[PDB]
Amino acid sequence: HCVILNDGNFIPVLGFGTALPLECPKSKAKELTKIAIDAGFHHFDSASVYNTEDHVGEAIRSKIADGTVRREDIFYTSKVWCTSLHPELVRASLERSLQKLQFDYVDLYLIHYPMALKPGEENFPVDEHGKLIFDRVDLCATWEAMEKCKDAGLTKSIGVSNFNYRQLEMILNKPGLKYKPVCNQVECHPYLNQMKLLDFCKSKDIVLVAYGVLGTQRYGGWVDQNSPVLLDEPVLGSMAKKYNRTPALIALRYQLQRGIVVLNTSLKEERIKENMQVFEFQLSSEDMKVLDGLNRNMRYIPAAIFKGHPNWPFLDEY
Amino acid sequence: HCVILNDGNFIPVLGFGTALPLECPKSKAKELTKIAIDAGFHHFDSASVYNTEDHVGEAIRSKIADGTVRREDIFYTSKVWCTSLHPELVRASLERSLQKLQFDYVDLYLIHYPMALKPGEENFPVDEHGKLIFDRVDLCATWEAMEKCKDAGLTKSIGVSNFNYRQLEMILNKPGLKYKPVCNQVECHPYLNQMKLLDFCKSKDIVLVAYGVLGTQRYGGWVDQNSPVLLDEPVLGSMAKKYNRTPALIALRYQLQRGIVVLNTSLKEERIKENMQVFEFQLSSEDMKVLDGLNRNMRYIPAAIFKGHPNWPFLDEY
Ligand SMILES: NC(=O)c1ccc[n+]([C@@H]2O[C@H](COP(=O)([O-])OP(=O)(O)OC[C@H]3O[C@@H](n4cnc5c(N)ncnc54)[C@H](OP(=O)(O)O)[C@@H]3O)[C@@H](O)[C@H]2O)c1
Numbered sequence A, B: 001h002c003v004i005l006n007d008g009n010f011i012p013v014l015g016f017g018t019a020l021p022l023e024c025p026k027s028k029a030k031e032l033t034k035i036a037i038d039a040g041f042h043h044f045d046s047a048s049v050y051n052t053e054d055h056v057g058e059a060i061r062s063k064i065a066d067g068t069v070r071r072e073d074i075f076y077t078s079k080v081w082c083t084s085l086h087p088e089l090v091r092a093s094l095e096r097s098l099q100k101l102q103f104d105y106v107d108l109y110l111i112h113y114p115m116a117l118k119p120g121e122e123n124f125p126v127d128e129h130g131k132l133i134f135d136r137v138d139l140c141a142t143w144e145a146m147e148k149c150k151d152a153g154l155t156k157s158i159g160v161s162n163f164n165y166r167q168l169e170m171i172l173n174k175p176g177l178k179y180k181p182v183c184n185q186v187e188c189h190p191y192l193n194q195m196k197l198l199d200f201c202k203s204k205d206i207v208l209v210a211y212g213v214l215g216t217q218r219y220g221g222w223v224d225q226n227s228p229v230l231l232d233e234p235v236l237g238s239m240a241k242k243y244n245r246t247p248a249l250i251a252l253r254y255q256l257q258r259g260i261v262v263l264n265t266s267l268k269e270e271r272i273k274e275n276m277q278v279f280e281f282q283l284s285s286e287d288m289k290v291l292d293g294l295n296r297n298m299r300y301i302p303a304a305i306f307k308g309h310p311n312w313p314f315l316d317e318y
């Protein structure tokens, strides 16, 4: 179950996310990755900032060793963090991730946010007032660095995450562009269906990869704990009954039928296995319209600590 | 590589057609079906009027018997001809086909044309002037018989072929309707892209299955021999070069990227194998637009001998 990226590479349409809530020990990522592989997942999403890469890598290499899967069958994504967006620091970060993973290459590498922060070991550098220290970096220069990573063979494909319409256009119209971003990984679910951004990406052969498909893991420090819980939406409960599935399966299927590559995370083995059942049924055209009606501009992860940054992506309509 | 029908069943998106030109011995169907199976084809399209069902059935059963494939992995389609549309004759025709195939069930059964003809052994009954003898049979009455065939387990799914927008509506609005048609098999290629009918079918959860994807086999007595040869289209040649593929592969991929289930036939082993490579590449969004521009209302199989029939489907815009 894959789709073809604009650079010719194949990406599985359903991927398991390896970000873990703060309350979880990082080693948890290793057990979950194993469980996911056994359940049939071949696409895994990670990032330098998650700090789960080494554990995810051990799980994968472990499943490759015992002959469960081959590296070529696994699609692994990483992301360069805000502190290494400087053109001279991008490749170093990728090489560091590859060292942690003990991998020869990653299948996809993305710019995590179009917002650079002060370079340094600390992922969240703050001043004496506790405010993040922003940095100015030419995003087009950063993209050129990403392209060089692809030409180095360190990553098979390159893309971006949390970019808005104008920022994507900035890259697409860049003089001397060599490789278009293969995707734009953003938050997307019934409460924030991204209709406009999705149509734009499609028109440019850019795949929209969605996180927050099930309402996000509601991370402390990022998601308002008082925001509504997506899966508690009555409409999803009613539709789950109609199709004799679950609210989660309904939300997952909704995105797949819109041409979106879906990410998902669960700390529970039973749910990891359940989510694979999304390929078992079809939502009717009319029910897809019903789900479209839930749109209410509810953004669970507005990256509020970045407010004020010149490149904060969520101010524009899309 | 399947899509989900509105009755829950799965259908492979690429199917091998078993209709043969008059110039071919019917037995040719047996060897071609075996070759298609070896190449990876699981979806086979046939019809009682083709007179190749017993040969196709023999090929499939031979491959099932030697362990190459399982019946459950094969998706076989048959169609009831105009002379058996009467409610009292539909089932007998399907049972007759099952007898020829030595199958217990077919996966899909279609009304071949929305035009009933005088009942009898002859598939093309004509009067003393050589004109087809039409018959009056309510399309909804015929559909009820199709539903009964599905309930009897003789066919897993039911659909139609060569129906226009209004005829589909007739079935969809039928009082007491039990099962919607899962598909509408019609001619479709860059010269007749069926944009409007396709959108209508999608809005009703009806899959559009296309034949004539490569310009049809240009059957004598049905297709104008001087009509342009689809694959000789310069645009397809240019695109084939750009993608390092072939005109045929470009035409096949075009339909797949539009959510269409594609049928294809070649009397040559090398081409049957080649067509399976359609899953290897992606046509850009921009090139898809260029192909949409080739539309010129060129209908290779207008069923001209049927002109005059009250239900001739090709007069309406769509
Ligand atoms: N690029 C970015 O900026 C960014 C940001 C955030 C996340 N991500 C990526 O997206 C991945 C997904 O994380 P997410 O935060 O967006 O969460 P999510 O996939 O939206 O999942 C949210 C919640 O769904 C629940 N869930 C999962 N399967 C379920 C089922 N079958 N039934 C009921 N509940 C179910 C989980 O709870 P339980 O664990 O209790 O089952 C989880 O807390 C991450 O791991 C990461 O790879 C990327």
Ligand SMILES: NC(=O)c1ccc[n+]([C@@H]2O[C@H](COP(=O)([O-])OP(=O)(O)OC[C@H]3O[C@@H](n4cnc5c(N)ncnc54)[C@H](OP(=O)(O)O)[C@@H]3O)[C@@H](O)[C@H]2O)c1
Pocket: B016, B017, B018, B019, B020, B045, B046, B112, B161, B162, B185, B210, B211, B212, B213, B214, B215, B216, B217, B218, B231, B246, B248, B249, B263, B264, B265, B266, B267, B268, B271, B272, B274, B275, B301
């Ligand atoms: N329901 C209906 O009314 C209806 C009507 C007509 C057909 N059909 C179905 O559709 C199926 C397909 O038949 P069709 O008439 O529509 O033909 P088609 O699939 O459009 O193929 C047309 C021609 O393409 C050529 N071709 C195939 N692969 C090729 C390649 N890789 N390179 C170059 N040329 C290639 C073939 O020639 P060669 O053999 O010389 O390679 C063939 O004559 C039938 O067998 C039948 O199952 C249904």
Ligand SMILES: C[C@]12CC[C@H]3[C@@H](CCC4=CC(=O)CC[C@@]43C)[C@@H]1CC[C@H]2O
Pocket: A019, A020, A021, A022, A047, A049, A050, A051, A219, A220, A222, A301
């Ligand atoms: C919210 C997001 C995923 C969760 C992480 C966060 C950075 C800080 C964090 C540190 C942790 O030890 C657990 C996860 C998380 C809370 C990430 C910023 C971008 C996005 O991927």
Ligand SMILES: C[C@]12CC[C@H]3[C@@H](CCC4=CC(=O)CC[C@@]43C)[C@@H]1CC[C@H]2O
Pocket: B019, B020, B021, B022, B047, B049, B050, B051, B219, B220, B222, B301
């Ligand atoms: C053109 C079409 C497929 C080809 C056949 C035709 C009926 C007469 C025929 C008789 C034959 O022995 C060979 C095929 C064919 C020429 C069919 C009518 C509807 C369509 O499926």
